[PDB]
Design goal:
This is part of a larger assembly, with chains A, B, C, D and E. Chain B is mainly α. Chain B has one helix and no strands. Classes of the chains: A alpha+beta, B mainly alpha, C alpha+beta, D mainly alpha, E alpha+beta. Chains in contact: C-E. The complex binds Cephaeline (2 copies), magnesium ion (92 copies) and zinc ion (ZN). One magnesium ion binds next to loops of chain D. Chain D binds four RNA strands through helix 2, helix 4, helix 5 and helix 6. Chain A: GO terms for molecular function: metal ion binding; mRNA binding; structural constituent of ribosome.
Amino acid sequence: PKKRASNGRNKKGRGHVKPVRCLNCARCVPKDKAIKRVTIRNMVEAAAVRDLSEASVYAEYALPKLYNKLHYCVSCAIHARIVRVRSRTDRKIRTPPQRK
Amino acid sequence: MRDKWRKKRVRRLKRKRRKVRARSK
Amino acid sequence: TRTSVLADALNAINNAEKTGKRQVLIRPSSKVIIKFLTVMQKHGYIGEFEYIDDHRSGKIVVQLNGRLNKCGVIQPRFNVKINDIERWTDNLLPARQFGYVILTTSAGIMDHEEARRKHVSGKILGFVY
Amino acid sequence: GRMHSSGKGISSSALPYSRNAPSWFKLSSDDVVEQIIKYARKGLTPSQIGVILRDAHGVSQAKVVTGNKILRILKSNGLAPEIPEDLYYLIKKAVSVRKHLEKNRKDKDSKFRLILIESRIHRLARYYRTVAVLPPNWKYESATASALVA
Amino acid sequence: GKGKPRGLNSARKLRVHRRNNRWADQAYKARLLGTAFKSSPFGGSSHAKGIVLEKIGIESKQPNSAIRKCVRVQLIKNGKKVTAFVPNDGCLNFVDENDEVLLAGFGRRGKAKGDIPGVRFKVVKVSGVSLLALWKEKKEKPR
RNA sequence: GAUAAGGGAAGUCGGCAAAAUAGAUCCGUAACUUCGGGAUAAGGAUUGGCUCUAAGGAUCGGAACGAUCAACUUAGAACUGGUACGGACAAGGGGAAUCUGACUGUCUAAUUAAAACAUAGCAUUG
RNA sequence: GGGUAAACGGCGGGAGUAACUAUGACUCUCUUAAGGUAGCCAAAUGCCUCGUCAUCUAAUUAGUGACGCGCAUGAAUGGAU
RNA sequence: AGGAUAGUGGCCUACCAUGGUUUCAACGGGUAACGGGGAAUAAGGGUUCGAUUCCGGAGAGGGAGCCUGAGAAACGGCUACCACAUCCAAGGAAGGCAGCAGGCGCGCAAAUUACCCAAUCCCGACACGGGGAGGUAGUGACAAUAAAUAACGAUACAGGUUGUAAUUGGAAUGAGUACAAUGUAAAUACCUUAACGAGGAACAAUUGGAGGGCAAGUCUGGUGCCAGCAGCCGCGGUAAUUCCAGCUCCAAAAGCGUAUAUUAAAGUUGUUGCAGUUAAAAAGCUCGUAGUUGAACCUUGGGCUUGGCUGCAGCCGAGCCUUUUUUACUUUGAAAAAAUUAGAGUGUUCAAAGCAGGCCUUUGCUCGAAUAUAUUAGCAUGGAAUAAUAGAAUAGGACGUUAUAUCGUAAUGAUUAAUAGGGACGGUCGGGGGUAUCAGUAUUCAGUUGUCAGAGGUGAAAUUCUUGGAUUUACUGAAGACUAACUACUGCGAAAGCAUUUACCAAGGACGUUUUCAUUAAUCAAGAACGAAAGUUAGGGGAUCGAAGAUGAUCAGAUACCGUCGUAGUCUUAACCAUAAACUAUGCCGACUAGGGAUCGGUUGUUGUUCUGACGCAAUCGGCACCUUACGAGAAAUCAAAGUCUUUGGGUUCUGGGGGGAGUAUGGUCGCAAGGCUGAAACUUAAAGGAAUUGACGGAAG
RNA sequence: GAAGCUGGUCAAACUUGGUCAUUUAGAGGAAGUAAAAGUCGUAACAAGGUUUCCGUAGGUGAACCUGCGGAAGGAUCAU
Ligand SMILES: CC[C@H]1CN2CCc3cc(OC)c(OC)cc3[C@@H]2C[C@@H]1C[C@H]1NCCc2cc(O)c(OC)cc21
Ligand SMILES: CC[C@H]1CN2CCc3cc(OC)c(OC)cc3[C@@H]2C[C@@H]1C[C@H]1NCCc2cc(O)c(OC)cc21
Ligand SMILES: [Mg+2]
Ligand SMILES: [Mg+2]
Ligand SMILES: [Mg+2]
Ligand SMILES: [Mg+2]
Ligand SMILES: [Mg+2]
Ligand SMILES: [Mg+2]
Ligand SMILES: [Mg+2]
Ligand SMILES: [Mg+2]
Ligand SMILES: [Mg+2]
Ligand SMILES: [Mg+2]
Ligand SMILES: [Mg+2]
Ligand SMILES: [Mg+2]
Ligand SMILES: [Mg+2]
Ligand SMILES: [Mg+2]
Ligand SMILES: [Mg+2]
Ligand SMILES: [Mg+2]
Ligand SMILES: [Mg+2]
Ligand SMILES: [Mg+2]
Ligand SMILES: [Mg+2]
Ligand SMILES: [Mg+2]
Ligand SMILES: [Mg+2]
Ligand SMILES: [Mg+2]
Ligand SMILES: [Mg+2]
Ligand SMILES: [Mg+2]
Ligand SMILES: [Mg+2]
Ligand SMILES: [Mg+2]
Ligand SMILES: [Mg+2]
Ligand SMILES: [Mg+2]
Ligand SMILES: [Mg+2]
Ligand SMILES: [Mg+2]
Ligand SMILES: [Mg+2]
Ligand SMILES: [Mg+2]
Ligand SMILES: [Mg+2]
Ligand SMILES: [Mg+2]
Ligand SMILES: [Mg+2]
Ligand SMILES: [Mg+2]
Ligand SMILES: [Mg+2]
Ligand SMILES: [Mg+2]
Ligand SMILES: [Mg+2]
Ligand SMILES: [Mg+2]
Ligand SMILES: [Mg+2]
Ligand SMILES: [Mg+2]
Ligand SMILES: [Mg+2]
Ligand SMILES: [Mg+2]
Ligand SMILES: [Mg+2]
Ligand SMILES: [Mg+2]
Ligand SMILES: [Mg+2]
Ligand SMILES: [Mg+2]
Ligand SMILES: [Mg+2]
Ligand SMILES: [Mg+2]
Ligand SMILES: [Mg+2]
Ligand SMILES: [Mg+2]
Ligand SMILES: [Mg+2]
Ligand SMILES: [Mg+2]
Ligand SMILES: [Mg+2]
Ligand SMILES: [Mg+2]
Ligand SMILES: [Mg+2]
Ligand SMILES: [Mg+2]
Ligand SMILES: [Mg+2]
Ligand SMILES: [Mg+2]
Ligand SMILES: [Mg+2]
Ligand SMILES: [Mg+2]
Ligand SMILES: [Mg+2]
Ligand SMILES: [Mg+2]
Ligand SMILES: [Mg+2]
Ligand SMILES: [Mg+2]
Ligand SMILES: [Mg+2]
Ligand SMILES: [Mg+2]
Ligand SMILES: [Mg+2]
Ligand SMILES: [Mg+2]
Ligand SMILES: [Mg+2]
Ligand SMILES: [Mg+2]
Ligand SMILES: [Mg+2]
Ligand SMILES: [Mg+2]
Ligand SMILES: [Mg+2]
Ligand SMILES: [Mg+2]
Ligand SMILES: [Mg+2]
Ligand SMILES: [Mg+2]
Ligand SMILES: [Mg+2]
Ligand SMILES: [Mg+2]
Ligand SMILES: [Mg+2]
Ligand SMILES: [Mg+2]
Ligand SMILES: [Mg+2]
Ligand SMILES: [Mg+2]
Ligand SMILES: [Mg+2]
Ligand SMILES: [Mg+2]
Ligand SMILES: [Mg+2]
Ligand SMILES: [Mg+2]
Ligand SMILES: [Mg+2]
Ligand SMILES: [Mg+2]
Ligand SMILES: [Mg+2]
Ligand SMILES: [Mg+2]
Ligand SMILES: [Zn+2]
């Protein structure tokens, strides 16, 4: 039977969507179907932000961030636990998980 | 067997039939 | 496109009656629609209805009284001989004691009982019960 | 709707209920007729004549004032075009598309649109032939179309 | 509008559409193609006589395990060779080589019956004497 | 260089040699195909002479008509004869397949004309 | 030391098996490399050989069609049509 | 025009034209095809059958030609050929059972070489003769009707005044046999009827079954996955409710079973009346001819009188007064063979039937032999709703009944403009298209520079490159691709698809409009345009990835997954190919049915807002979607359409009919090929399949 | 007025050729089904241990593997 009303992607009123490569395995996945995550991490880990600030020649120097948008295929994401199998009724919930 | 490979096997066998019949035309 | 305004009118009446509304708007109007409604009203299946003139085909507002089970058209309008009226009433009506098959005969649009009274037949047009 | 598309737009004009001239209209049934003939001699089609009339002269409808439709008045005064206006504009569009197509052979979209436009021309010309507006032997020819809409 | 024409003048379309679609019904198709006339071993008949060629035991299909005792019969009318089951306990001893047997179907109308594979006929009479009469010792085989 | 009863390749390495066919008009024409062909495929009928008939043009005259002039083509009919008649001359035998070279073309003057050479097409090298 | 086969050319020997019989679908090791693929065949190329089967005939070392561990077929030394 | 014919007619001839039929299915092919009245089955609609008691046609072994005659292309007439075949003295001659009977053959499949003109009728010169026409009997379980195989007492018991279970009686009767009479042409039989004719009333009922479907055993013996049964599901391996038997019981019964065909069941052929998201099945997408189907609108209302029929009302008919061209359809009628069907009457002893029959007993009286149905077409007819069609637009229009080309009459003559369509116009809006053009970094490769031992790749390695300087670093350049981030439950396009800038070229939807035309439209066999990727042909390009291939790992083996290279290809130009899970697995057009918040484009009204634009708040039209509910639908999953579907009919195209064989074979057609489109059958099979539930399992998550 | 004769006309029938239709042999080749679950592997069903499937094209004892583009009928309706 039909598992999802969206067919597991996000294509409505559209014919074709160009693919993207999974970050992990380089598999061609449609752009609307790919699991996309935007990560903004500190470029220096919090353990080293101290000794690097002490070694800094600049008073009040801000450490730059690391901006990245990651694309995963369904297999990459499920394997890496980026997304998990949800119950039949919980599948419909499409709000971001309440963790942050 | 997989339907796609079953189709490929039958296509190769039709091809052989045509080539065999062409000998005597 | 719009191939039968009588079918559209009766479909609108059926949907309003099924949903419990006591009034329905029909667009467009026509003579056949008005005379079909007149037959339904004479037999009490609808109340007063109103014709609105818009310098076009027109509009109708019908008052429904909740007595109507179903009204419908028969497409196409088959030719009906007098001996075929029995077959049509058998197939279309819920019982032999109530309900009407509406015909358009050269004597006018009328229910099958009046058609039997004046011994006329025409083309089948619809039903009501 | 949209004979040659999937659109379902309903935008159009809504004629007023009144079939009489507005009370504030003061022009006579003649002065509109001479205005129409003057614009028809300037080369305007009936659509444009009605547009100029309502836009600048307050003639809401030429029929409620003069008594006749604009094309009917032109035909009564010998100003009716040989080709009906809508067929003329369809043929002109087909001429423009075919001229673009001969220089842009890879424009497969224009080839598809040309087929749509020409089918619409043939359907309208068939109607005009059945109503004897066009001669029974009138036929739309792609090769000689540019002459009619020159 | 239900996918079929409803116009008062569409009788040709309705009649032709039904005519095209009755060919999907195998009973109608077999009746008009005449497959019994062309393909059936009996040629459309209910019964057929023939000569017993040999007595053959056929293993029943799973899950059954038995030896269904049939004969190979060559039909007189067309020379075709068929396999015919010999019903009842021990009626194979009533059937000898070069006997004339009257055959009939199993009642499944061209299909095999039960666990017997590829056999569509049964012996009704042998040497002009009913097999039931022989089985019940009502009559004796003329020999 | 001719002819030959009956048979008709039994002759011979092998149908070599010879015979048979043959012009024209009309009919009819298969497999296969690179759609161009194959093809005159295959396979049939007729054909003389004489007496007629019909059709097909030019220039003049003011006319869908008159006058004058003019070429050989085609079609039809009757009659006729020892059934003959492309009457001498001239003039394809045909078909079903296999091997091989695509084809037209070329060479061993004076023993080999071929499957050999060339060829268009294709590819490589500087 | 590297490249190059529409360069010259080459493309093999060995080791086991299926509820009658027959066959063998079923792995590694050597020669300086690869080990004959698609095709085709007793062919103008096959020794054995007048190969075996079918067809053609009264009778066929001939012909054709099949078969193929092919002495010694095979891809621009071009293969098959 | 003639000839010929009984006569019309290309029936035939001469001359002359080039016509005639066809997707509304011509022509060809098949028919195990003579047509019809009719038959079977049947709620209705249907499906199937009709060689065969009547009517029409045709034939007499196959063809053909004739004679005679009013009538024949005759065959129980002739002539000839072909095929069969008889006698012969070898020279010749004679044939036609698809008439009756009979034989052979064929086959699953069908009767006597009997009696007669008595009836029905026919023929003849005819009151008289003849008739295998016909009737009668024989064979005959083709079908159909009626209908025996027992009934009643007493004891004895059981039993709640009576139903039986047994051993005891006397009655009754026809099956059969027969005097006889009848029947009949003569018989047979029937009907009547002396005498005979029943206790085991042996004067003896069978065919199939007893697991379920499906009515009736869990009795006994036998066998032991054998034998066998079993339409299907299944039974049988030592207590078999299923086989083989005995007993008992069940069903129909002078009948019962089996095979095959057909009808119902089958709403599994669907017009009534199916199904197409996932079970089989919406064409990849548009255009489009035939076909089918297409908005509304033109004498309505009122008044008076009157006829009839139902119990003052009601229902039909009228008749006046109010300004008063072609069909289709439906009504009625005429004409429509009998048999068959339905049906009225009628004690064939009942009945199937038949069309007889009934009366006080008749030198005769007398009810009858009805009536419906047929149904397309034709004919006649009443009605004018519904659906078509024509008319007066360059007026060549209508009336002048008694007007004289003119003149005069006249209200002189054009329906709305559809929340159908088409067109114009106005500001837009789009990652819609084509042609150029302009970026961007990246990748790789190259040139310079700098150091020095590794670099690459992996789970770990190895192939590989490296002191000849790899990898790394900065600058510069060249090639091809590709357009990141922005990028979304957002946009555009018929779909496939489309994303750097700008210019040009031609399109487009929506919106706005008191513009224009007026049915021009919807869906569409045939026929077309476009149609991802891969693939083919030929040029150009060939950075990167990368079928094939080469190679290093893993492994028992992997010429697989993983790693490093790599040829076609990937890009482009000219052409082909025409297919995808081309998917929303959901045709298109139209109407209606329920709440809500977002969002894109357009338009229209308005702010404690920033700076005209943006934003904010309201409406609306169009889109892409989404959330809730379930009125409703559905097998369910689910669905605002997959609803308005047994309360079944808005228009229209396509497709499916258990699973395989098989999208195969064959034929055709398109293609250079790969292949596309169209497309079977034999045979085989009881399930295959859809959705959901519980569990079990998972090298899935928690 | 017989036989017979001339020329026509209708035209059976035979030979050849063509065509249509229905049956049938065949070395060998290549299938399908049934039977039993015989050999080899393990392609699918669990993330079936490389997600599966579609179209297309190569390769290969066999299931199958690989490239390109699709689909979810996915193992994600979601950041
Ligand atoms: C007198 C001429 C005749 C005589 N006759 C007698 C009969 C006869 C019969 C034949 O057979 C029946 C035949 O057989 C050939 C030949 C002859 C000779 C042939 C000769 C001429 C001939 N001589 C030899 C070659 C030749 C070349 C030419 O150029 C040429 O032209 C003039 C002619 C020739
Ligand atoms: C690609 C072919 C095989 C080769 N073999 C050799 C033995 C081995 C031993 C290991 O451990 C010592 C190991 O590390 C995991 C990986 C292997 C690889 C794994 C691979 C199986 C693959 N298919 C499914 C399982 C899997 C898991 C992975 O993580 C993974 O990554 C590369 C890959 C896989
Ligand atoms: Mg797609
Ligand atoms: Mg109306
Ligand atoms: Mg009517
Ligand atoms: Mg609309
Ligand atoms: Mg209709
Ligand atoms: Mg001789
Ligand atoms: Mg001789
Ligand atoms: Mg000879
Ligand atoms: Mg010889
Ligand atoms: Mg010889
Ligand atoms: Mg010799
Ligand atoms: Mg010799
Ligand atoms: Mg010679
Ligand atoms: Mg010739
Ligand atoms: Mg040569
Ligand atoms: Mg020489
Ligand atoms: Mg020399
Ligand atoms: Mg020489
Ligand atoms: Mg080899
Ligand atoms: Mg080989
Ligand atoms: Mg060989
Ligand atoms: Mg060979
Ligand atoms: Mg040789
Ligand atoms: Mg030989
Ligand atoms: Mg020889
Ligand atoms: Mg050979
Ligand atoms: Mg060699
Ligand atoms: Mg060689
Ligand atoms: Mg005449
Ligand atoms: Mg004539
Ligand atoms: Mg026909
Ligand atoms: Mg017949
Ligand atoms: Mg019947
Ligand atoms: Mg019949
Ligand atoms: Mg019949
Ligand atoms: Mg009959
Ligand atoms: Mg009969
Ligand atoms: Mg008769
Ligand atoms: Mg006759
Ligand atoms: Mg006879
Ligand atoms: Mg005869
Ligand atoms: Mg006779
Ligand atoms: Mg005769
Ligand atoms: Mg006779
Ligand atoms: Mg007889
Ligand atoms: Mg007979
Ligand atoms: Mg008895
Ligand atoms: Mg039994
Ligand atoms: Mg029971
Ligand atoms: Mg027992
Ligand atoms: Mg026992
Ligand atoms: Mg028993
Ligand atoms: Mg039975
Ligand atoms: Mg049925
Ligand atoms: Mg169904
Ligand atoms: Mg499926
Ligand atoms: Mg399906
Ligand atoms: Mg679709
Ligand atoms: Mg369309
Ligand atoms: Mg219509
Ligand atoms: Mg209408
Ligand atoms: Mg409008
Ligand atoms: Mg960009
Ligand atoms: Mg956008
Ligand atoms: Mg579209
Ligand atoms: Mg259609
Ligand atoms: Mg089509
Ligand atoms: Mg190239
Ligand atoms: Mg390996
Ligand atoms: Mg590479
Ligand atoms: Mg290419
Ligand atoms: Mg393609
Ligand atoms: Mg498809
Ligand atoms: Mg999809
Ligand atoms: Mg589909
Ligand atoms: Mg469609
Ligand atoms: Mg709708
Ligand atoms: Mg509706
Ligand atoms: Mg907006
Ligand atoms: Mg507005
Ligand atoms: Mg929902
Ligand atoms: Mg939806
Ligand atoms: Mg099926
Ligand atoms: Mg399931
Ligand atoms: Mg035929
Ligand atoms: Mg596996
Ligand atoms: Mg897997
Ligand atoms: Mg594995
Ligand atoms: Mg695997
Ligand atoms: Mg590989
Ligand atoms: Mg790989
Ligand atoms: Mg699933
Ligand atoms: Zn993946």
